[PDB]
Amino acid sequence: QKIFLTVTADLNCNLFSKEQRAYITTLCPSIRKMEGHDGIEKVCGDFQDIERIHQFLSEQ
Amino acid sequence: QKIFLTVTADLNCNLFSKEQRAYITTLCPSIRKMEGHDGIEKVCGDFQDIERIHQFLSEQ
Amino acid sequence: QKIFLTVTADLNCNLFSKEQRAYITTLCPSIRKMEGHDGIEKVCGDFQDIERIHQFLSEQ
């Protein structure tokens, strides 16, 4: 089965814009998002999507 | 410059025993954990730690 | 003087409709939310915000 049933990550919203963090919807379409007027602040799902999101923000 | 301010993982406690999950606090001594009648169910820390915990459990 | 830095609540999506849970963004404009297929599933914010949400929903 799965090692991690789910993984959640608090995003740095000082470091990355609404526009940068909004791409996560296209990068990982089935990632669950905690979102404000400030855009995506937390993400939840498979460890593979958290890695993919970390890779993506790491490059910005 | 933290990408993920924190990261939290839900451990699959069906796949892994209390003894197997117990080592996580030696593996990552500054980890934070949530602990029931069958030991460690959830963990919180750096991305690096959650990657090391995934690596470790992945090899059992 | 924050006692709770943030507070997250899991909503009883069986008890309340998408239309009932949808008002939360109008009730609490500054709130953060996570939206599955049947609307808002989880909410993050201030204690006071989570309190007013409990009240609003308790009277449906």
Next chain:
Amino acid sequence: QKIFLTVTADLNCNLFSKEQRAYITTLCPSIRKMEGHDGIEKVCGDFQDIERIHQFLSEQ
């Protein structure tokens, strides 16, 4: 049936010592806790229990 399935609160560990925070074990022996070497950082449980902990901490 209940309004909030669970509630989680990030505790202000700057405003409240390890020892003040440790009493939450006595206050709500049923509350699930995220804890490391500065003690309880996050609590998860029933709305009523979150209220009691906020009520306790606010009375300090």
